[PDB]
Amino acid sequence: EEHVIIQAEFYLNPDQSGEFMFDFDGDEIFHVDMAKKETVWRLEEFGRFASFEAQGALANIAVDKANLEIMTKRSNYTPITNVPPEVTVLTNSPVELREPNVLICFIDKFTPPVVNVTWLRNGKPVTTGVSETVFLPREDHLFRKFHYLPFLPSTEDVYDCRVEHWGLDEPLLKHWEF
Amino acid sequence: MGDTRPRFLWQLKFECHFFNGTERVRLLERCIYNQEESVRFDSDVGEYRAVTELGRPDAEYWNSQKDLLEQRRAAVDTYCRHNYGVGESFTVQRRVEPKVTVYPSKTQPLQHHNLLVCSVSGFYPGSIEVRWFRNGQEEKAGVVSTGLIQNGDWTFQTLVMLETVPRSGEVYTCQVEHPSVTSPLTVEWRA
Amino acid sequence: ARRPPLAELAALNLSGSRL
């Protein structure tokens, strides 16, 4: 019985975007929301068992930003090389007509951690009930991300997860059908 | 995304590795610039080491501060063991039982089904064994799987597929052992 | 905050800084 707990942070320029999170065997325990300055548990029930003071994570993001600036200069302004994502679409559970299910767009092996993701039903954007994870760390120091779409399976609708990323030449469209 | 200015990325990773509860614990700290680790602390060593040339100044600076090193060396207790103790009940001890369903499928359009799919979904932890049986005898030929799929929400799924030519009267069983249950889950399919 | 806290490890400044 091996286990691993990882505290993972990043800061990216020039986007000025940061993340702070804890990972247990590949799942997210919590992240800190930067704009609200607040601990966001991945599952609500975790907040019944443990706390986390977000202030310390904000203090770490400030150091990370400064350090990014030092390193950027020390490297002679070497920028990151884009690695485009691998995308898979699947469901939660076995698909049955008219039974609630969830489509998962799984976006993997990419960097930097900026990606544009749209759910399409029959070619048109859907926002109803969508949600997404923060960026999860990989051992190769690339990123993993999940986007979710609750849906009613039918023979009238097809779906696409549309992913754009700097490493891709054109948007990447992953198709799903009953 | 029309903004194609160069990106510069910093990451930090503090990893607590646990073997046999907290009996053996190893802390690894990593600083990563872009996609490249620059400097590391490993609690088996107890000082920083440069992973690449760019990390050398940091290793030297930090290792000059024995007060700082002492604190990192103590973190195996004050950080790794402490967090394990806090998180154990809802991470290490989390158990969610698999939902098991079996349905037939086809390798290509065909008049008859020639695949039995064993769907095992919604479970935690990821450790699982899924076996196919025909009339009480384990089938090892003709079996392919997705492997273990992380859902992102502290559940896993897998599909385990058996290519076969069913004959009526035959009973196929999908058998699942997972830490959440003390005896196997089984779902039977009659052809 | 009644529940036992998860503790972060603090980030260190690199060689070449101040703040």
Author numbering:
A (entry chain A): 3 to 180
B (entry chain B): 0 to 190
C (entry chain C): 2 to 20
Q: What did the publication describing this PDB structure actually write?
A:
CD4+ T-cells orchestrate immune responses to antigens through the binding of highly variable αβ T-cell receptors (TCRs)5 to peptide epitopes presented on major histocompatibility class II (MHC-II or in humans HLA-II) molecules. Due to the open-ended nature of the peptide-binding groove of HLA-II, compared with the closed groove of HLA-I, loaded peptide epitopes can vary in length typically between 12 and 20 amino acids. Thus, outside of the 9-amino acid “core” binding region, HLA-II peptides can extend out of the binding groove, forming peptide-flanking residues (PFRs). Here, we focused on understanding how PFRs might influence CD4+ T-cells to the oncofetal antigen 5T4, which is up-regulated in a number of epithelial-derived cancers including colorectal cancer (CRC).
We did, however, determine the crystal structure of HLA-DR1 in complex with the full-length 5T4111–130 20-mer peptide at 1.95 Å resolution. In addition, unbiased omit map analysis provided no evidence of partial occupancy that may result due to register shifting of the epitope. This therefore defined the core nonamer-binding region of the immunogenic peptide as 5T4117–125 (FARRPPLAELAALNLSGSRL; underlined) flanked by six N-terminal PFRs, henceforth N-PFRs (FARRPP) and five C-terminal PFRs, henceforth C-PFRs (SGSRL). Deterioration of electron density at the N and C termini caused an increase in assigned isotropic displacement B-factors within the three most N-terminal residues (FARRPP-) and two most C-terminal residues (-SGSRL), suggesting that these PFR regions exhibit high flexibility. Interestingly, we observed contrasting features at each terminus, whereby the N-PFR largely nestled along the -DRα chain, whereas the C-PFR elevated away from the HLA. This was mediated by two consecutive prolines (Pro-(−1) and Pro-(−2)), which incorporated a di-proline kink that positioned the N-PFR adjacent to the α2 domain of the peptide-binding groove. Instead, the C-PFRs formed a hairpin loop structure mediated primarily by intramolecular (peptide to peptide) contacts; causing the protrusion of the peptide away from the HLA binding groove's influence and back to the core peptide region.
